[PDB]
Structure 1
Amino acid sequence: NLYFQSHMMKFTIQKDRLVESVQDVLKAVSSRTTIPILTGIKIVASDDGVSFTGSDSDISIESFIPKEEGDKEIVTIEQPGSIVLQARFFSEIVKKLPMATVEIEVQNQYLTIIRSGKAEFNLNGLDADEYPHLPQIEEHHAIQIPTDLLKNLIRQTVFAVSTSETRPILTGVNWKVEQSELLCTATDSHRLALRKAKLDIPEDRSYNVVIPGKSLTELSKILDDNQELVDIVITETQVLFKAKNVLFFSRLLDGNYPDTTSLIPQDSKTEIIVNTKEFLQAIDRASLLARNVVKLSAKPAESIEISSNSPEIGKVVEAIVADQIEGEELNISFSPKYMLDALKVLEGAEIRVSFTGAMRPFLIRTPNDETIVQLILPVRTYVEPEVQEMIVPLTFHYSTNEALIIEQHKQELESVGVFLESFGSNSYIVRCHPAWFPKGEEAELIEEIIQQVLDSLREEAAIMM
């Protein structure tokens, strides 16, 4: 007779693997998108199995399901084909399908039928060919990292990236490869996270890229916990992570990451060794009065005293028996969040903290491991609020009319905490800024402050607080 298909795509699949792939892929989908079809999920049924793709133009994930995963049959493809369904909705359905077996059938008008047990869903389908193609990346000069290590690398660095849109490049983690050793660097202006890893790669290859922190976090969520290798292909604008049945793409951040190797102190006046948990719990307790700034005081052969006070709300004092103390007596103030973020990430029972006075950065490490380094900037105390310095100072360019004004009213700026350096002509940098500033919005405020001087602080600063 005359052939005319009853349907486009049709296959049967186990619910557990279906859900699993949809959850992974869904992590690449964004509600806020400027390209409509990117709210969808691309399904491709072939003779070998079914793949699921989701993307938000910055990252892309493809999860594949072989039709056979052992004795059992996972997928039964009756008619290869493809369709795009709404991702968020497709996720909600599949999670709550009653029975194990799931039938998916795309009819000739792209209406997609989903059957499990006695429940039948119908979905408006979109033509798969309208869905963007994966980034074309040739797999050459690839790198191999064990999964658990890779997840540790991420975990020990992503948190420290900037959340501000002021400097896009600082929202990503700097991956530098040289002499077969990976150096992951992440920093917001207030603190820095470093991680180093040795890889079985030819010493000749060199890489210097910046991967968005969010991408690495979502990648980590998808990776299982094992020792098997993850394949990594780095290019000029993309990075591809490969694992079992998973392809993960991330767009690299354009630009040049700042050098920080010089910024890391190499010599310390005072070194403290103490139990991780006991020290951690004490800092957390002193953070209850954040209404912000914790103070630390230590002397050799003597206890450590962490303290903080909030005006008219209260004060707190806690003492820990150190494990070892050597060097100058010190009284240093720092943000407990940064301290905490660093500590939650270290695996050792005890830690090593190195300082060089109360006015310079201090390091947090494991006792006998040089692989991980956590850097934090302290808070300067003026007996005129408390001030926090920046690792990578913010730079602002100004007109000559406004540039002259900045120096004229510079004395008052200092009194507010707007401690500019005045390094560039007609453009001053920000070495220090008031500690009470909210994270990720330091640049914004520091701008509006100056804007008033050119458009005109007591009343202002009061309405802002």
Structure 2
Amino acid sequence: MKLTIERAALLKALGHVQSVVERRNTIPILSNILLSAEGDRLSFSATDLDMEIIDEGFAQIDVPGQITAPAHTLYEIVRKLPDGADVSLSFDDPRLVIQAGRSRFNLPVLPAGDFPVMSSDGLSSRIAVDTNELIRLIDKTRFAISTEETRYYLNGLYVHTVNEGGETKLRAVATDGHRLALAEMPAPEGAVGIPGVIVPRKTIAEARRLMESAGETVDLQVSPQKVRFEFGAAALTSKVIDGAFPDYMRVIPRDNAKILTLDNDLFAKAVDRVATISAEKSRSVKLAVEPGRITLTVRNMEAGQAVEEVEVDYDGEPFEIGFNARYLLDVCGQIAGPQAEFRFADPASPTLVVDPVDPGVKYVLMPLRV
């Protein structure tokens, strides 16, 4: 292998793929990038076995070939090279030689034949999804995905279509067992009837990162075993979580009749204030709801109390309900306009939060005893 490539091109590709590589990874080849030179392109692949990121850059290829080399180290070297440098990559020592200006690096390689192969058999045809739309699906819901390390059905984003309101919707649902987030859009042409898949948490994160540099649309492919996002030259192919996502429709309350509307910014500030008396990781807040008012109370585990009254629009029966303060603030953080609407049943039942300026989202909070 022998080629020359512009620093900016090399850096752009390296930066895109190297994100998947775990810092704390133990199998040496999974710390590497597969470099594949052919024609007028250098291809770049990295993986953590669950997902693979690929990217391509233009290069002047004197001799085609394939090698693997340490990903973060290669990225860091190139980052530190002078602006505008042309970079020579040469594989008669067995190391990859990187030369630019008056710098020369020799990096140990591992054989390209030991690098894992992510198969894309079985995928649907490409479905073009508006990029901003996809970004909204993710940003409205991903906070509710569980951060646990397991391969449990809660540790990813359930992407599926539903036939509702005279329209098929492309819908994303996240839950960690404590709260739920739902966001949807009109189903793009070709998405209607995709199989429902649970996209892993890390895959969503990496896809969302790549979306920051994407064009007008992102191509999506789906099978029951895989998902693929294409962002022009870059692509992310991932396994999906094997199992049955819960019947979340059973959790999302339809009939909650105690409806309350409030000033979301003022309420969120009040919740945040009263929650300040606790330095504890988990902080519960009591909402004493009555006509015209919510009285918020937080207590810590060292005798401290905080109370705040917030005027709200409500004229039903009084009741008291508790929520994890962070989960409540997370919901208020998603609301796009000045009001939030809450729908309650009894203090033991799930609570619905709706956004009057976005009918395409739903949030569910599960109550607790403080």
* Structure 1 and Structure 2 fold alike (TM over 0.5): yes
Unpaired runs of at least 5, structure 2: none
Letter aligned with residue 305 of structure 1 = T
| Structure-to-structure mapping, 1:225-240, within 5 angstroms | 228-240=216-228
Contact 1:29 1:54 in 2 (8 A): yes
Q: In the aligned structure 1, how far is the partner of 2:245 from the partner of 2:87?
A: 49
Contact 1:102 1:114 in 2 (8 A): no
In structure 2, do the counterparts of structure 1 residues 116 and 99 end up closer, same or farther at CA, with 3 Å as the change threshold?
farther
Contact 1:178 1:206 in 2 (8 A): no
Letter aligned with residue 172 of structure 1 = G
> Structure 1 residue 190: deviation in Å?
1.1
SS in 2 for 1:240: strand
SS in 2 for 1:23: helix
The one-character-per-residue Cα deviations of 1:422-446 (angstroms, maximum 9, x if unpaired) are xxxxxxxxxxxxxxxxxxxxxxxxx
Q: In the aligned structure 2, how far is the partner of 1:16 from the partner of 1:113?
A: 18
Aligned to 1:344: 333
> Structure 1 residue 341: deviation in Å?
2.0
SS in 1 for 2:8: helix
Aligned to 1:460: none
In structure 2, do the counterparts of structure 1 residues 14 and 295 end up closer, same or farther at CA, with 3 Å as the change threshold?
same
Larger Rg: 1
> Structure 1 residue 259: deviation in Å?
0.4
1:160 aligned to which of 140, 144, 149? 144
Q: How many residues align structurally? A: 363
Aligned to 1:36: 28
SS in 2 for 1:44: strand
Aligned to 1:211: 199
Contact 1:148 1:225 in 2 (8 A): no
Contact 1:12 1:101 in 2 (8 A): no
2:364 aligned to which of 375, 391, 394? 375
2:6 aligned to which of 14, 25, 39? 14
1:117 aligned to which of 85, 91, 101? 101
> Structure 1 residue 314: deviation in Å?
1.7
Higher relative contact order (CA 8 A, sep 6+): 2
In structure 2, do the counterparts of structure 1 residues 227 and 106 end up closer, same or farther at CA, with 3 Å as the change threshold?
closer
The one-character-per-residue Cα deviations of 1:102-159 (angstroms, maximum 9, x if unpaired) are 3232234432222233222221122223322232335534322211211221122222
The one-character-per-residue Cα deviations of 1:253-309 (angstroms, maximum 9, x if unpaired) are 111111010221112232222233222222112221224111112333x23322212
1:307 aligned to which of 297, 321, 324? 297
Contact 1:146 1:229 in 2 (8 A): yes
Q: In the aligned structure 1, how far is the partner of 2:184 from the partner of 2:81?
A: 45
1:285 aligned to which of 273, 290, 295? 273
More strand by share: 2
1:132 is the counterpart of 2:116: yes
Deviates more, 1:350-359 or 1:131-140: 131-140
Root mean square deviation, CA, Å: 2.2
SS in 2 for 1:379: coil
Aligned to 1:317: 307
Letter aligned with residue 212 of structure 2 = D
Aligned to 1:79: 63
Letter aligned with residue 179 of structure 2 = R
Contact 2:97 2:105 in 1 (8 A): yes
Deviates more, 1:343-352 or 1:31-40: 31-40
Contact 2:129 2:219 in 1 (8 A): yes
| Structure-to-structure mapping, 1:58-457, within 5 angstroms | 58-65=50-57, 67=58, 75-137=59-121, 140-164=124-148, 168-179=152-163, 180-202=168-190, 205-224=193-212, 228-290=216-278, 291=280, 292-300=283-291, 302-322=292-312, 324-380=313-369, 386=370
In structure 2, do the counterparts of structure 1 residues 178 and 295 end up closer, same or farther at CA, with 3 Å as the change threshold?
closer
Contact 2:256 2:344 in 1 (8 A): yes
Contact 1:296 1:331 in 2 (8 A): yes
Letter aligned with residue 50 of structure 2 = D
Contact 1:37 1:131 in 2 (8 A): yes
TM-score (norm 1): 0.73
Q: In the aligned structure 2, how far is the partner of 1:254 from the partner of 1:138?
A: 16
Letter aligned with residue 359 of structure 1 = A
> Structure 1 residue 350: deviation in Å?
2.0
SS in 2 for 1:304: strand
Q: In the aligned structure 2, how far is the partner of 1:126 from the partner of 1:164?
A: 32
In structure 2, do the counterparts of structure 1 residues 318 and 117 end up closer, same or farther at CA, with 3 Å as the change threshold?
farther
Contact 2:170 2:188 in 1 (8 A): no
Contact 2:11 2:75 in 1 (8 A): yes
SS in 2 for 1:29: coil
Contact 1:99 1:117 in 2 (8 A): no
Contact 2:34 2:44 in 1 (8 A): yes
Contact 1:270 1:356 in 2 (8 A): yes
Q: In the aligned structure 2, how far is the partner of 1:15 from the partner of 1:95?
A: 8
Q: In the aligned structure 1, how far is the partner of 2:215 from the partner of 2:187?
A: 14
Q: In the aligned structure 2, how far is the partner of 1:355 from the partner of 1:192?
A: 15
The one-character-per-residue Cα deviations of 1:369-404 (angstroms, maximum 9, x if unpaired) are 321111111112xxxxx4xxxxxxxxxxxxxxxxxx
